[PDB]
Amino acid sequence: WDNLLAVIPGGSSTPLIPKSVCETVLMDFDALVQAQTGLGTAAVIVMDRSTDIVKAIARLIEFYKHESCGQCTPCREGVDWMNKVMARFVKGDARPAEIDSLWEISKQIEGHTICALGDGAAWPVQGLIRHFRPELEERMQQFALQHQ
Amino acid sequence: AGLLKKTTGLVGLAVCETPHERLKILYTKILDVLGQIPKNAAYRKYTEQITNEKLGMVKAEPDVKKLEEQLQGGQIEEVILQAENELSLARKMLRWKPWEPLVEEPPANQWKWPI
Amino acid sequence: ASATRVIQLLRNWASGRDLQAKLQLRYQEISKRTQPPPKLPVGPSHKLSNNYYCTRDGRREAMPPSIVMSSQEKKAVTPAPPIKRWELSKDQPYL
Ligand code: SF4
């Protein structure tokens, strides 16, 4: 249990949750909804301290960019924009306010898309922002001094 | 009151040496001419409101130096000038009589900018 | 500046004041005409955090004039409080 840093609860779209949230929650629709996620397809992916969460959702959001049909502007443009800024986040090439922007454009594509893939892309990054905020700051902070 | 101030600081407007009673007799005069205009008139009610009220302390308080801030309208020597102007208005709108409804409603939508 | 002292007394005495303290023309005191490049600030709303134009809509927040009375016991008021007699100059009231 101590090894697992966070868990994808029920699907890639469903925002991942850490041990601090998943210590007692039952995998049910109502409890998942109040856990700021969803059970969806019960795709439970457990993920440990060793692996980096930003890299974990990096491949997910890269996959999402590889699957948007491009029909509506928010999904066609926003997901690609998310991929580029997040790729910097893996190294940490941003400022404190970029997480707030990544928060901002996530809400912009949340629900404004024709289909539920756009907000389906909002939720994973949205959960990542809300939970491991200090992790983003320190990895981004590490980016600054190593490339001083 | 006190020593008669040499000049008012406004060229053309002189200093009246007996200002308090001149302001008195003016204020009665506008009250007098305001008798003609019937009671329902709003202009009458407005100036029958500020005349006697402003006639109050000028009748009571005799010091024109304190009368400056009693009326908060600058020097007394031009307050009476303004009082004369109010008397001129009473004479003027005794002809105007604007208590009737509008002469004309505005022709169609001549107002309502923009076009 | 060039001007010898005996000339300076003549100018100072005739005008009744000392002029070498400050002169009409310029001298080395001016800033050099090759000032370093500047680093002009950014706008107050330049942040890439929440900055939606839905907040600042100066042109759009304008409202057509408010309707108060249209053709289609009372108090007496004034458009503004009467002005306040400002006091004399503290540094030099009577010039
Ligand atoms: S959100 Fe759906 S409809 Fe819009 S571009 Fe993406 S896949 Fe197409």
PDB file of N, CA and C in Angstrom, chain C residues 28-93:
ATOM      1  N   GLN C  28      27.586  70.076 -19.007  1.00  0.00           N
ATOM      2  CA  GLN C  28      27.805  68.646 -18.798  1.00  0.00           C
ATOM      3  C   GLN C  28      26.732  67.975 -17.946  1.00  0.00           C
ATOM      4  N   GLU C  29      25.879  68.764 -17.290  1.00  0.00           N
ATOM      5  CA  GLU C  29      24.874  68.204 -16.392  1.00  0.00           C
ATOM      6  C   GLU C  29      23.846  67.338 -17.112  1.00  0.00           C
ATOM      7  N   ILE C  30      23.657  67.526 -18.418  1.00  0.00           N
ATOM      8  CA  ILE C  30      22.616  66.786 -19.123  1.00  0.00           C
ATOM      9  C   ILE C  30      22.975  65.307 -19.192  1.00  0.00           C
ATOM     10  N   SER C  31      21.945  64.468 -19.252  1.00  0.00           N
ATOM     11  CA  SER C  31      22.154  63.041 -19.432  1.00  0.00           C
ATOM     12  C   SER C  31      22.696  62.765 -20.829  1.00  0.00           C
ATOM     13  N   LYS C  32      23.621  61.815 -20.918  1.00  0.00           N
ATOM     14  CA  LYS C  32      24.222  61.480 -22.199  1.00  0.00           C
ATOM     15  C   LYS C  32      23.180  60.893 -23.143  1.00  0.00           C
ATOM     16  N   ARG C  33      23.359  61.165 -24.434  1.00  0.00           N
ATOM     17  CA  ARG C  33      22.386  60.808 -25.458  1.00  0.00           C
ATOM     18  C   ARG C  33      22.464  59.345 -25.878  1.00  0.00           C
ATOM     19  N   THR C  34      23.096  58.491 -25.080  1.00  0.00           N
ATOM     20  CA  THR C  34      23.215  57.064 -25.362  1.00  0.00           C
ATOM     21  C   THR C  34      22.818  56.261 -24.127  1.00  0.00           C
ATOM     22  N   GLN C  35      21.649  56.583 -23.577  1.00  0.00           N
ATOM     23  CA  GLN C  35      21.188  55.942 -22.359  1.00  0.00           C
ATOM     24  C   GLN C  35      20.989  54.442 -22.576  1.00  0.00           C
ATOM     25  N   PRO C  36      21.155  53.640 -21.528  1.00  0.00           N
ATOM     26  CA  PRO C  36      21.073  52.181 -21.673  1.00  0.00           C
ATOM     27  C   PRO C  36      19.680  51.741 -22.080  1.00  0.00           C
ATOM     28  N   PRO C  37      19.552  50.562 -22.684  1.00  0.00           N
ATOM     29  CA  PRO C  37      18.236  50.076 -23.113  1.00  0.00           C
ATOM     30  C   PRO C  37      17.302  49.895 -21.930  1.00  0.00           C
ATOM     31  N   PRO C  38      16.025  50.215 -22.098  1.00  0.00           N
ATOM     32  CA  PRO C  38      15.059  50.078 -21.007  1.00  0.00           C
ATOM     33  C   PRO C  38      14.419  48.693 -20.976  1.00  0.00           C
ATOM     34  N   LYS C  39      13.650  48.459 -19.912  1.00  0.00           N
ATOM     35  CA  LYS C  39      13.004  47.174 -19.661  1.00  0.00           C
ATOM     36  C   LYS C  39      11.552  47.407 -19.232  1.00  0.00           C
ATOM     37  N   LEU C  40      10.817  48.174 -20.046  1.00  0.00           N
ATOM     38  CA  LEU C  40       9.445  48.624 -19.812  1.00  0.00           C
ATOM     39  C   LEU C  40       8.581  47.564 -19.136  1.00  0.00           C
ATOM     40  N   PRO C  41       7.748  47.953 -18.167  1.00  0.00           N
ATOM     41  CA  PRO C  41       6.962  46.964 -17.417  1.00  0.00           C
ATOM     42  C   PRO C  41       5.880  46.296 -18.251  1.00  0.00           C
ATOM     43  N   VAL C  42       5.202  45.323 -17.657  1.00  0.00           N
ATOM     44  CA  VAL C  42       4.106  44.638 -18.304  1.00  0.00           C
ATOM     45  C   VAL C  42       2.793  45.154 -17.729  1.00  0.00           C
ATOM     46  N   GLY C  43       1.690  44.832 -18.398  1.00  0.00           N
ATOM     47  CA  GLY C  43       0.387  45.292 -17.983  1.00  0.00           C
ATOM     48  C   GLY C  43      -0.079  44.648 -16.694  1.00  0.00           C
ATOM     49  N   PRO C  44      -0.968  45.332 -15.970  1.00  0.00           N
ATOM     50  CA  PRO C  44      -1.515  44.740 -14.739  1.00  0.00           C
ATOM     51  C   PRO C  44      -2.305  43.473 -14.992  1.00  0.00           C
ATOM     52  N   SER C  45      -3.005  43.393 -16.124  1.00  0.00           N
ATOM     53  CA  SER C  45      -3.754  42.206 -16.509  1.00  0.00           C
ATOM     54  C   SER C  45      -2.978  41.334 -17.488  1.00  0.00           C
ATOM     55  N   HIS C  46      -1.649  41.394 -17.444  1.00  0.00           N
ATOM     56  CA  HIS C  46      -0.816  40.579 -18.317  1.00  0.00           C
ATOM     57  C   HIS C  46      -0.673  39.147 -17.826  1.00  0.00           C
ATOM     58  N   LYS C  47      -1.213  38.828 -16.654  1.00  0.00           N
ATOM     59  CA  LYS C  47      -1.052  37.492 -16.100  1.00  0.00           C
ATOM     60  C   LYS C  47      -1.746  36.464 -16.983  1.00  0.00           C
ATOM     61  N   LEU C  48      -1.140  35.288 -17.080  1.00  0.00           N
ATOM     62  CA  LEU C  48      -1.700  34.160 -17.808  1.00  0.00           C
ATOM     63  C   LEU C  48      -2.552  33.257 -16.924  1.00  0.00           C
ATOM     64  N   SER C  49      -2.781  33.658 -15.675  1.00  0.00           N
ATOM     65  CA  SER C  49      -3.798  33.074 -14.811  1.00  0.00           C
ATOM     66  C   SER C  49      -5.150  33.648 -15.208  1.00  0.00           C
ATOM     67  N   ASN C  50      -6.154  33.530 -14.335  1.00  0.00           N
ATOM     68  CA  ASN C  50      -7.484  34.033 -14.661  1.00  0.00           C
ATOM     69  C   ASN C  50      -7.423  35.495 -15.089  1.00  0.00           C
ATOM     70  N   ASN C  51      -7.756  35.751 -16.356  1.00  0.00           N
ATOM     71  CA  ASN C  51      -7.632  37.071 -16.959  1.00  0.00           C
ATOM     72  C   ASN C  51      -8.742  37.327 -17.970  1.00  0.00           C
ATOM     73  N   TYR C  52      -9.880  36.657 -17.808  1.00  0.00           N
ATOM     74  CA  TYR C  52     -10.933  36.689 -18.814  1.00  0.00           C
ATOM     75  C   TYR C  52     -11.392  38.115 -19.084  1.00  0.00           C
ATOM     76  N   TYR C  53     -11.589  38.435 -20.364  1.00  0.00           N
ATOM     77  CA  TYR C  53     -12.116  39.743 -20.730  1.00  0.00           C
ATOM     78  C   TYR C  53     -13.542  39.943 -20.240  1.00  0.00           C
ATOM     79  N   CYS C  54     -14.214  38.872 -19.810  1.00  0.00           N
ATOM     80  CA  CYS C  54     -15.537  38.997 -19.211  1.00  0.00           C
ATOM     81  C   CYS C  54     -15.522  39.869 -17.965  1.00  0.00           C
ATOM     82  N   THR C  55     -14.359  40.040 -17.335  1.00  0.00           N
ATOM     83  CA  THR C  55     -14.258  40.910 -16.170  1.00  0.00           C
ATOM     84  C   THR C  55     -14.139  42.372 -16.585  1.00  0.00           C
ATOM     85  N   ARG C  56     -13.113  42.700 -17.367  1.00  0.00           N
ATOM     86  CA  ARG C  56     -12.883  44.076 -17.807  1.00  0.00           C
ATOM     87  C   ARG C  56     -13.540  44.267 -19.171  1.00  0.00           C
ATOM     88  N   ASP C  57     -14.660  44.982 -19.189  1.00  0.00           N
ATOM     89  CA  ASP C  57     -15.408  45.265 -20.410  1.00  0.00           C
ATOM     90  C   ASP C  57     -15.810  46.730 -20.456  1.00  0.00           C
ATOM     91  N   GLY C  58     -14.857  47.615 -20.166  1.00  0.00           N
ATOM     92  CA  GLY C  58     -15.103  49.044 -20.098  1.00  0.00           C
ATOM     93  C   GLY C  58     -15.995  49.586 -21.196  1.00  0.00           C
ATOM     94  N   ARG C  59     -15.716  49.200 -22.441  1.00  0.00           N
ATOM     95  CA  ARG C  59     -16.592  49.581 -23.543  1.00  0.00           C
ATOM     96  C   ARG C  59     -17.956  48.913 -23.422  1.00  0.00           C
ATOM     97  N   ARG C  60     -17.988  47.648 -22.997  1.00  0.00           N
ATOM     98  CA  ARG C  60     -19.246  46.913 -22.946  1.00  0.00           C
ATOM     99  C   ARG C  60     -20.021  47.178 -21.662  1.00  0.00           C
ATOM    100  N   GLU C  61     -19.334  47.519 -20.569  1.00  0.00           N
ATOM    101  CA  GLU C  61     -20.029  47.818 -19.321  1.00  0.00           C
ATOM    102  C   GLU C  61     -20.791  49.133 -19.372  1.00  0.00           C
ATOM    103  N   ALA C  62     -20.589  49.941 -20.409  1.00  0.00           N
ATOM    104  CA  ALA C  62     -21.339  51.180 -20.546  1.00  0.00           C
ATOM    105  C   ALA C  62     -22.819  50.883 -20.745  1.00  0.00           C
ATOM    106  N   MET C  63     -23.662  51.748 -20.189  1.00  0.00           N
ATOM    107  CA  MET C  63     -25.097  51.568 -20.163  1.00  0.00           C
ATOM    108  C   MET C  63     -25.755  52.806 -20.761  1.00  0.00           C
ATOM    109  N   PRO C  64     -26.746  52.653 -21.637  1.00  0.00           N
ATOM    110  CA  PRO C  64     -27.524  53.810 -22.083  1.00  0.00           C
ATOM    111  C   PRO C  64     -28.038  54.615 -20.904  1.00  0.00           C
ATOM    112  N   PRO C  65     -28.300  55.906 -21.103  1.00  0.00           N
ATOM    113  CA  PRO C  65     -28.666  56.769 -19.974  1.00  0.00           C
ATOM    114  C   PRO C  65     -29.889  56.245 -19.236  1.00  0.00           C
ATOM    115  N   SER C  66     -29.846  56.354 -17.911  1.00  0.00           N
ATOM    116  CA  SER C  66     -30.914  55.826 -17.077  1.00  0.00           C
ATOM    117  C   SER C  66     -32.170  56.676 -17.216  1.00  0.00           C
ATOM    118  N   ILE C  67     -33.305  56.015 -17.421  1.00  0.00           N
ATOM    119  CA  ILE C  67     -34.587  56.701 -17.512  1.00  0.00           C
ATOM    120  C   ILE C  67     -35.056  57.042 -16.105  1.00  0.00           C
ATOM    121  N   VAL C  68     -35.348  58.322 -15.867  1.00  0.00           N
ATOM    122  CA  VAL C  68     -35.756  58.809 -14.555  1.00  0.00           C
ATOM    123  C   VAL C  68     -37.142  59.446 -14.596  1.00  0.00           C
ATOM    124  N   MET C  69     -37.387  60.323 -15.568  1.00  0.00           N
ATOM    125  CA  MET C  69     -38.754  60.760 -15.826  1.00  0.00           C
ATOM    126  C   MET C  69     -38.883  60.942 -17.326  1.00  0.00           C
ATOM    127  N   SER C  70     -39.974  60.440 -17.894  1.00  0.00           N
ATOM    128  CA  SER C  70     -40.236  60.566 -19.317  1.00  0.00           C
ATOM    129  C   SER C  70     -41.615  61.171 -19.529  1.00  0.00           C
ATOM    130  N   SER C  71     -41.753  61.908 -20.631  1.00  0.00           N
ATOM    131  CA  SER C  71     -43.047  62.490 -20.973  1.00  0.00           C
ATOM    132  C   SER C  71     -44.084  61.407 -21.239  1.00  0.00           C
ATOM    133  N   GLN C  72     -43.693  60.351 -21.942  1.00  0.00           N
ATOM    134  CA  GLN C  72     -44.608  59.263 -22.266  1.00  0.00           C
ATOM    135  C   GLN C  72     -44.770  58.320 -21.080  1.00  0.00           C
ATOM    136  N   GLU C  73     -43.751  64.660   1.646  1.00  0.00           N
ATOM    137  CA  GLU C  73     -43.826  66.015   1.117  1.00  0.00           C
ATOM    138  C   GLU C  73     -42.437  66.377   0.588  1.00  0.00           C
ATOM    139  N   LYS C  74     -42.397  67.112  -0.522  1.00  0.00           N
ATOM    140  CA  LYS C  74     -41.174  67.275  -1.299  1.00  0.00           C
ATOM    141  C   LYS C  74     -40.077  67.986  -0.510  1.00  0.00           C
ATOM    142  N   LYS C  75     -38.831  67.668  -0.853  1.00  0.00           N
ATOM    143  CA  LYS C  75     -37.657  68.356  -0.336  1.00  0.00           C
ATOM    144  C   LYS C  75     -37.042  69.224  -1.427  1.00  0.00           C
ATOM    145  N   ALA C  76     -36.190  70.153  -1.006  1.00  0.00           N
ATOM    146  CA  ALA C  76     -35.424  70.992  -1.919  1.00  0.00           C
ATOM    147  C   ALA C  76     -33.979  70.511  -1.952  1.00  0.00           C
ATOM    148  N   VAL C  77     -33.476  70.222  -3.153  1.00  0.00           N
ATOM    149  CA  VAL C  77     -32.136  69.684  -3.341  1.00  0.00           C
ATOM    150  C   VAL C  77     -31.385  70.544  -4.351  1.00  0.00           C
ATOM    151  N   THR C  78     -30.079  70.315  -4.425  1.00  0.00           N
ATOM    152  CA  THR C  78     -29.178  70.975  -5.354  1.00  0.00           C
ATOM    153  C   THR C  78     -28.395  69.919  -6.120  1.00  0.00           C
ATOM    154  N   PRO C  79     -27.916  70.235  -7.329  1.00  0.00           N
ATOM    155  CA  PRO C  79     -27.168  69.226  -8.097  1.00  0.00           C
ATOM    156  C   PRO C  79     -25.911  68.752  -7.396  1.00  0.00           C
ATOM    157  N   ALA C  80     -25.341  69.567  -6.517  1.00  0.00           N
ATOM    158  CA  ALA C  80     -24.184  69.190  -5.720  1.00  0.00           C
ATOM    159  C   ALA C  80     -24.132  70.103  -4.508  1.00  0.00           C
ATOM    160  N   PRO C  81     -23.422  69.709  -3.454  1.00  0.00           N
ATOM    161  CA  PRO C  81     -23.227  70.615  -2.320  1.00  0.00           C
ATOM    162  C   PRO C  81     -22.540  71.891  -2.768  1.00  0.00           C
ATOM    163  N   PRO C  82     -22.931  73.039  -2.218  1.00  0.00           N
ATOM    164  CA  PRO C  82     -22.284  74.297  -2.605  1.00  0.00           C
ATOM    165  C   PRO C  82     -20.798  74.262  -2.294  1.00  0.00           C
ATOM    166  N   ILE C  83     -20.023  74.958  -3.131  1.00  0.00           N
ATOM    167  CA  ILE C  83     -18.574  74.879  -3.018  1.00  0.00           C
ATOM    168  C   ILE C  83     -18.113  75.423  -1.668  1.00  0.00           C
ATOM    169  N   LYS C  84     -16.919  75.006  -1.269  1.00  0.00           N
ATOM    170  CA  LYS C  84     -16.322  75.434  -0.015  1.00  0.00           C
ATOM    171  C   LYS C  84     -15.312  76.534  -0.298  1.00  0.00           C
ATOM    172  N   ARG C  85     -15.452  77.653   0.405  1.00  0.00           N
ATOM    173  CA  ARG C  85     -14.501  78.752   0.317  1.00  0.00           C
ATOM    174  C   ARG C  85     -13.116  78.258   0.714  1.00  0.00           C
ATOM    175  N   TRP C  86     -12.206  78.127  -0.249  1.00  0.00           N
ATOM    176  CA  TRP C  86     -10.855  77.699   0.085  1.00  0.00           C
ATOM    177  C   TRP C  86     -10.106  78.811   0.808  1.00  0.00           C
ATOM    178  N   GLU C  87      -9.275  78.411   1.763  1.00  0.00           N
ATOM    179  CA  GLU C  87      -8.508  79.355   2.556  1.00  0.00           C
ATOM    180  C   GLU C  87      -7.384  79.968   1.723  1.00  0.00           C
ATOM    181  N   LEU C  88      -6.752  80.994   2.289  1.00  0.00           N
ATOM    182  CA  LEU C  88      -5.627  81.654   1.647  1.00  0.00           C
ATOM    183  C   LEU C  88      -4.435  80.705   1.534  1.00  0.00           C
ATOM    184  N   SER C  89      -3.412  81.164   0.818  1.00  0.00           N
ATOM    185  CA  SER C  89      -2.191  80.386   0.656  1.00  0.00           C
ATOM    186  C   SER C  89      -1.438  80.317   1.978  1.00  0.00           C
ATOM    187  N   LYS C  90      -1.004  79.112   2.352  1.00  0.00           N
ATOM    188  CA  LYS C  90      -0.204  78.968   3.563  1.00  0.00           C
ATOM    189  C   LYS C  90       1.229  79.432   3.343  1.00  0.00           C
ATOM    190  N   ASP C  91       1.800  79.149   2.169  1.00  0.00           N
ATOM    191  CA  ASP C  91       3.176  79.552   1.897  1.00  0.00           C
ATOM    192  C   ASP C  91       3.290  81.060   1.706  1.00  0.00           C
ATOM    193  N   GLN C  92       2.388  81.646   0.921  1.00  0.00           N
ATOM    194  CA  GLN C  92       2.427  83.075   0.646  1.00  0.00           C
ATOM    195  C   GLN C  92       1.035  83.557   0.257  1.00  0.00           C
ATOM    196  N   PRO C  93       0.227  84.005   1.215  1.00  0.00           N
ATOM    197  CA  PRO C  93      -1.155  84.383   0.895  1.00  0.00           C
ATOM    198  C   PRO C  93      -1.263  85.690   0.127  1.00  0.00           C
TER     199      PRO C  93
END
